[PDB]
Amino acid sequence: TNIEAYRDGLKLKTEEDFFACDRQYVCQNYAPVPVVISKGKGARVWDINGNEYYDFLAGVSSLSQGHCHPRVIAALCRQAERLTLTLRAFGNDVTGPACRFMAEMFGYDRVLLMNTGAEAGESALKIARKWAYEVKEIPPDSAKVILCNNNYWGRTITACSSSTTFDCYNNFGPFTPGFELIDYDDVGALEEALKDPNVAAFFVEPIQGEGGVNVPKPGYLKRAHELCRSKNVLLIVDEIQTGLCRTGRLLAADHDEVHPDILLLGKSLSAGVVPISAVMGRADVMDVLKPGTHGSTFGGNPLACAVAVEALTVLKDEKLADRAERLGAQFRDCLRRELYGKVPWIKEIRGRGLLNAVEVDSDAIDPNDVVMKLKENGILSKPTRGRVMRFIPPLVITDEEHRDATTRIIKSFLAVEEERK
Whole-angstrom distance, CA of residue 147 vs CA of residue 280: 19
**CB-based contact 277:115 (threshold 8 Å):** yes
Residues ≥6 apart with Cβ < 8 Å to 253: 206, 221, 237, 239, 259, 260, 263
- At closest approach, how far in Å is the CB of 418 from its own copies? 27
> Any idea what DSSP says for residue 266?
-
- At closest approach, how far in Å is the CB of 43 from its own copies? 14
Our CB check for its own copies shows the closer of 45 and 194 to be 45
> Any idea what DSSP says for residue 262?
E
407 is in an annotated binding site: no
- At closest approach, how far in Å is the CB of 277 from its own copies? 10
Our CB check for its own copies shows the closer of 203 and 345 to be 203
- At closest approach, how far in Å is the CB of 197 from its own copies? 16
Our CB check for its own copies shows the closer of 96 and 219 to be 96
Our CB check for its own copies shows the closer of 18 and 345 to be 18
Our CB check for its own copies shows the closer of 68 and 415 to be 68
193 is in an annotated binding site: no
Of 43, 16, 124, nearest in space to 320 by CA: 43
28 is in an annotated binding site: no
- At closest approach, how far in Å is the CB of 106 from its own copies? 11
Distance of CA 410 to the CA centre of its chain: 25
Whole-angstrom distance, CA of residue 377 vs CA of residue 52: 10
297 is in an annotated binding site: yes
Our CB check for its own copies shows the closer of 145 and 321 to be 145
Amino acid at 14: T
- At closest approach, how far in Å is the CB of 310 from its own copies? 5
> H-helix or E-strand containing 376?
helix 367-376
Q: 3-state DSSP call for residue 158?
A: helix
Whole-angstrom distance, CA of residue 114 vs CA of residue 111: 10
Q: 3-state DSSP call for residue 199?
A: strand
Whole-angstrom distance, CA of residue 86 vs CA of residue 101: 20
User: Residue positions in the annotated binding site?
Assistant: 117-118, 241, 297
